[PDB]
């Protein structure tokens, strides 16, 4: 649809992102203002079609890790958390199998929870 | 945690997956039985630590698109829908930053819905 | 206005087109039906400017001549009825003059009707 | 489908173009707007059939922009708005697909209206 | 922060600019001042983010100088006053330093007033 | 008037700048505070003329991004918010037109406010 703002949330701290770039088959996002620059999440979002109707969509959400630097008191950023959700749906896919696959794979976090949120390695 | 079954769902048609292989830093899954083999979704799931505490988890959910072959009436499979959710969290990450990033990035489907479920290319 | 869905019609059988790509001073379109070689009507719109106020708009509406095969869901396409429309409006053109020129050019179909629809004449 | 005067109009001011030549395979039109004789619209309309049945019709409507110089009392020509409309119909096109394609292409002005009448670009 | 008409004014005569295109990464504006359509101000406004968080915004306000030729009664364009305002904000800039920097730079007109409004040079 | 001390402000925190050099058609500025790499805001002013009355004024307001270190009096600087403002006024520009052009351009901050201060938008 027409590019607009998105309200990526996690239940307690919503984040409003706005389209601040992109191109053809691509749409960058960035949070309006958290506290400074480089401490703002982004939601780069591409999409393209190969030879067939293979709807090769892609995503990348980068939330940077910020921490105080009391020796100077400047909110330096240490690193970022990267989540890439690639999606590939072939041309032969009916409209209901595409909806089945996308919603199911996004239901992993509800089912395979503790190994993603906490980072522990299953034995 | 200990490997077990998962109940990947999309609200109407739950899918029970069971661990049928894997290794160290890997755990394959497969649906018990939908109607035959090669028509069963899989939820390959890996995880590893690099030099740093970069919790480089990885996922791959594959749901195959099956269709009847009335000329022979054998339920042949045409292709598959693939969803890859890669996650990278560095060592410097606070335990609350990881949960924030994971849940926010998984909230994309709730936020950026119509371009994923339907496949339309936003303009 | 913004890139939206257009309802290109002929009085009896409307066709809805939604933007499918483009860029700056460029806007593709296509309809909702699906096919292999030629999918649907594709109204490309290529407006731009020049040294002066020479608004050098340009259009191209392709409708694919197709017939639906039996026992196969590929609706074989046979050709395409290309209809180009190029517009060149000078810098000195008052917006009333431009409206007159465009609405008079697009009134040919109601004046030079038989020669365009049937494809004959001028004895 | 004989050659006669046509009454191209925009709704407000009709302009009557009369033939001024062309021969076989084309027809030139021009209104009176006498004094000056070169300051009036024209409708160069040609048509032909290639090796196949590919009907290649072509229209070119030119409207010059006049300015009555009150000092000298002569009409001056500052430029011209040009609208070209090429129509290609392949050998395999049905008699109703022609009408569909033509009336849909000429219906752009009612769909893509603000981008043509006023000269905007869609954002 | 959606695209809508803006009401740029100097205190005496407001001018209303409405969007006329741009797509992602920029936005074009232009007032009506109809007849002629090229004799009215514009506000080409761009913005992007580089490899870092360097927000390189950019504006350009061109106002053409008109002259109503009473002899012919047509509007002539003699030239345009161009005002470019480039803004670069580095990756490390706090959200309150942006307001300090931008609002101070745009306060020059109140400080260096005579050298800009009248065109003098300081001696 | 003559080169003097300007009081560039933003409504809350004023800064006083005194000339620090330059020449003919050139005037540097800087504030009172003292640092090692980047001292203070530095507003350069580079007006000149051309073949015609083409008054090609030019500005640049750099405000360094600084945070004071602990135990050391060097107030480490991190970047600079460059804001260039170039002006090109033609020979035929009546001084009433030039006043409108400059004051309307500097009213963007009050019309295109959120996109400039916050650094987001245009959906």
Q: Which residue from D70, D120, D122 is facing E72, i.e. has the nearest CB?
A: D70
Within 8 A of B120 by CB-CB distance, chain C residues are: 18
DSSP letters, C21-37, are -EETTEE--B-S---SS
Q: Which residue from E1, E24, E93 is facing A37, i.e. has the nearest CB?
A: E93
For A72, E54, F110, F117, the CA distances from F113, given in Å and listed in that order, are 32, 19, 5, 6
| Cβ within 8 Å of residue E68, ≥6 positions away | E74, E75, E76
Resolution limit in angstroms?
3.6
DSSP-assigned beta bridge partners for residue E87: E57, F83
Q: Which residue from F69, F78, F123 is facing A18, i.e. has the nearest CB?
A: F123
- Structural biology method used: cryo-EM
Q: Does A23 touch chain E (CB under 8 A)?
A: yes
The helix/strand/coil state of B99 is helix
Q: Which residue from C10, C47, C118 is facing D104, i.e. has the nearest CB?
A: C10
Cα atoms found within 13 Å of the Cα of residue F13, Cβ hemisphere only = 10
Tell me how far apart the alpha carbons of residues A84 and A63 are, in angstroms, rounded to a whole number. Answer: 12
Contact D76, D69 (CB under 8 A): yes
DSSP-assigned beta bridge partners for residue A67: A76
Structure tokens at F107: 């009213």
Cα atoms found within 13 Å of the Cα of residue F6, Cβ hemisphere only = 31
| Cβ within 8 Å of residue E105, ≥6 positions away | F8, F59, F61, F83, F85
Tell me how far apart the alpha carbons of residues F76 and F63 are, in angstroms, rounded to a whole number. Answer: 14
DSSP-assigned beta bridge partners for residue B3: none
Mutate to test the interface with C, among D81, D90, D98, D114 (most CBs of C within 10 A): D81
The helix/strand/coil state of B20 is coil
Q: Are A122 and B41 in contact (CB < 8 Å)? A: no
DSSP letters, F18-45, are B---EETTEE--B-S---SS--S-EEEE
Phi, psi of D114 (to 5 degrees): -65, -25
Q: Are D1 and C115 in contact (CB < 8 Å)? A: yes
**Strand B26-27, strand B17-19: pairing:** unpaired
Tell me how far apart the alpha carbons of residues F46 and F26 are, in angstroms, rounded to a whole number. Answer: 4
Mutate to test the interface with B, among C1, C4, C16, C19 (most CBs of B within 10 A): C19
Q: Which residue from C24, C53, C95 is facing E35, i.e. has the nearest CB?
A: C95
Q: Which chains touch F (3 or more CB pairs under 8 A)?
A: A, E
**Nearest-Cα residue of chain D relative to residue E38:** D119
Size of interface C-E (CB pairs under 8 A): 26
Q: F69-83 b/e with 16+ CB inside 10 Å = b?
A: eeeeeebbbbbbbbb
Q: Does F107 touch chain E (CB under 8 A)?
A: yes
**Strand E42-46, strand E55-69: pairing:** antiparallel
Secondary structure tally for chain F: helices H, strands E: 3, 5
Contact B18, B7 (CB under 8 A): no
**Nearest-Cα residue of chain C relative to residue D6:** C111
Structure tokens at F111: 């019309």
Within 8 A of B121 by CB-CB distance, chain C residues are: 20-21
Q: How far is F37 from chain E (nearest CA, A)?
A: 16
Q: Are E43 and F108 in contact (CB < 8 Å)? A: yes
DSSP letters, B53-95, are S-B-BEEEEEEEEEE--TTT---EEEEEEEEEEEEE--TT--H
Q: Are D81 and C91 in contact (CB < 8 Å)? A: no
Tell me how far apart the alpha carbons of residues E87 and F60 are, in angstroms, rounded to a whole number. Answer: 10
B–A contact: 3+ Cβ pairs < 8 A: yes
Residue B103: its H or E element = helix B95-106
Q: Which residue from A27, A65, A100 is facing B10, i.e. has the nearest CB?
A: A100
Q: Does B25 touch chain A (CB under 8 A)?
A: yes
For B26, E109, F36, F60, the CA distances from E105, given in Å and listed in that order, are 57, 9, 23, 8
* F residues 60-99 lying closer than 8 A (beta carbon) to E: 61, 63, 65, 78-95, 97-99
* D residues 28-67 lying closer than 8 A (beta carbon) to C: 41, 43, 45, 47, 55, 57, 59, 61, 63, 65
CB-CB neighbours of B62 under 10 Å: 18
Q: Which residue from B83, B100, B106 is facing A63, i.e. has the nearest CB?
A: B100
Q: Which chains touch A (3 or more CB pairs under 8 A)?
A: B, C, E, F
Cα atoms found within 13 Å of the Cα of residue A58, Cβ hemisphere only = 11
Contact D19, D28 (CB under 8 A): yes
DSSP-assigned beta bridge partners for residue A18: A30
Residue B114: its H or E element = helix B114-117
For E41, E68, E77, E84, F91, the CA distances from E81, given in Å and listed in that order, are 9, 18, 12, 10, 10
Q: Is the peptide bond before D50 cis (omega within 30 degrees of 0)?
A: no
**Nearest-Cα residue of chain C relative to residue A52:** C36
Q: How far is A49 from chain C (nearest CA, A)?
A: 11
Structure tokens at A24: 């053809």
Q: Are A32 and F118 in contact (CB < 8 Å)? A: yes
Tell me how far apart the alpha carbons of residues F19 and F25 are, in angstroms, rounded to a whole number. Answer: 13
Tell me how far apart the alpha carbons of residues E32 and E27 are, in angstroms, rounded to a whole number. Answer: 16
Q: Which residue from A2, A23, A24 is facing C2, i.e. has the nearest CB?
A: A2
Residue with tokens 């989540």: A83
Contact D103, D87 (CB under 8 A): no
- List helix spans (H) across C46-121: 95-105, 108-111, 113-117
Within 8 A of B82 by CB-CB distance, chain A residues are: 86-88
The helix/strand/coil state of F117 is helix
Residue A38: is it exposed, middle or buried by C-beta count within 10 angstroms (0-12/13-18/19+)? middle
Phi, psi of C96 (to 5 degrees): -70, -45
Q: Which residue from A78, A98, A121 is facing B25, i.e. has the nearest CB?
A: A121
CB-CB neighbours of C53 under 10 Å: 17
Residue (of A115, A103, A62) closest to A84 by Cα position: A62
Q: C6-23 b/e with 16+ CB inside 10 Å = b?
A: bebbbeeeebebbbbebe
Angle at A112 between CA B84 and CA B8, to 5 degrees: 75
Within 8 A of F63 by CB-CB distance, chain E residues are: 97, 100-101, 104
**Nearest-Cα residue of chain D relative to residue E18:** D120
C-alpha dihedral, A103 to A108 to A110 to A115, nearest 10°: -160
Length of chain C: 123
Q: How far is D34 from chain C (nearest CA, A)?
A: 19
């Amino acid at each position: 649809a027409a590019r607009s703002s998105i309200v990526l949330t996690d239940g307690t701290t919503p984040v409003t992102l706005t389209p601040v770039g992109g191109g053809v088959g691509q749409t960058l996002y960035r949070a309006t203002a958290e506290a400074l620059s480089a401490a703002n999440p982004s939601l780069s979002f591409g999409y393209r079609f190969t030879d067939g109707g293979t709807n090769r969509q892609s995503l990348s959400y980068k939330q940077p890790i910020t921490a105080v630097d009391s020796t100077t008191s400047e909110t330096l950023v240490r690193g970022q958390c990267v989540v890439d959700i690639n999606i590939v749906i072939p041309r032969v896919a009916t409209a209901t199998d595409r909806a089945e696959a996308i919603k199911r794979a996004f239901d992993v976090l509800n089912a395979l929870n503790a190994e993603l949120i906490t980072g522990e390695g299953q034995w």
